[PDB]
Design a binder for this molecule. Sequence first.
Ligand SMILES: *C/C=C(C)/C=C/C=C(C)/C=C/C1=C(C)CCCC1(C)C
Length: 227
Amino acid sequence: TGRPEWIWLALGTALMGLGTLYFLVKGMGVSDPDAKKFYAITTLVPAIAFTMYLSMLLGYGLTMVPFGGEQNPIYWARYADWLFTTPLLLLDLALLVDADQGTILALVGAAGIMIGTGLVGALTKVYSYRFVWWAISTAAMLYILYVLFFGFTSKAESMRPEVASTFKVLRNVTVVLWSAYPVVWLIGSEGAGIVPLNIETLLFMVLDVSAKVGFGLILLRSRAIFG
Ligand SMILES: *C/C=C(C)/C=C/C=C(C)/C=C/C1=C(C)CCCC1(C)C
């Protein structure tokens, strides 16, 4: 096939793969129980992303949805990735500030809606309805970010400054990266179709790699992960 976005798919596969192995090797050396906990969640994140970037690289996770008078290329393998990677990143942040079980359940549920309605939207054939679903997904995301900024940050204050300060960074990198996804979807292939797929794939890999491997490096190199 040789689609124009494959080079970006091959770069995301490489970065995710390398990041997985570094975390894995660093994780099986640590003896601390809590550290092990964080290491196992943070290594699984880029491991799932790697398998999906690799599948997309190989021609899977791609479907042609009809709307706007075109046969539009929608990479659904992405939501198969995010359906398990977003709630896992939320768990890393939840365990860090000692969030409650109700909070975690509500954040994971919200994340499920966000990705579910997102895909339903990327698959919808009525152009205007694609944006109705997009709208609900975004509203779910704003709920998650609100909790992370108002809820979590507040409970991270019962932690030590080292733990509170690591959370602020992970919390900030998350608020900045996550807010970007809905905009890329809106002006990209799933939405307006203003930004071409090849460029769109490049934006997503920079966001995906930063949000997982970038997030993992910051978190796993900190002492806040220790029991
Ligand atoms: C490793 C992947 C990460 C951290 C992905 C985060 C993805 C989002 C915050 C995605 C959000 C979306 C919306 C708000 C609405 C439209 C569709 C999505 C799923 C692209």
